[PDB]
Amino acid sequence: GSSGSSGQIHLFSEPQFQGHSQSFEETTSQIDDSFSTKSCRVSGGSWVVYDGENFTGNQYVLEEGHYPCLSAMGCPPGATFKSLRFISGPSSG
């Protein structure tokens, strides 16, 4: 039906892409032990991170790029993502 540029997100427990790391190619609902994430890495489409489970609560999207810290992403100092939603952003049609 709809296909194009692949998408994926790379989360890192510690800032500067350090410490623990977790990548998600498909839409996630629960994070590994709700492991906090200070830095992330978007690649191919945007990604929404909800502090609540089942994509509930507040949502914070992320453009394509490299986020060394949270500030740059916008998220407040002390946010914990529980669910993820891969955004195909662009679509051929």
Distances (CA, A) of 3 to 6, 21, 27, 34: 8, 27, 16, 30
| DSSP result, 16-70 | TTEEEEEEESS--SS-GGG---SEEEEESSEEEEESSTTS-S-EE---SEEESSH
How far apart (Å, rounded) are the C-alpha atoms in residues 30 and 22?
12
Q: How far apart are CA 92 and CA 24, in angstroms?
A: 23
Phi and psi angles of residue 20, each rounded to the nearest 5 degrees, phi first: -70, 155
Spatial neighbors of 33 by CB under 8 A, at least 6 apart, are none
Tell me the technique behind this structure.
NMR
**Cβ–Cβ under 8 Å, residues 60 and 31:** no
What 3-state class would DSSP assign to 71? helix
Please check whether the domain covering 1-93 is classified as CATH 2.60.20.10. yes
Q: 41 near 48, Cβ under 8 Å?
A: no
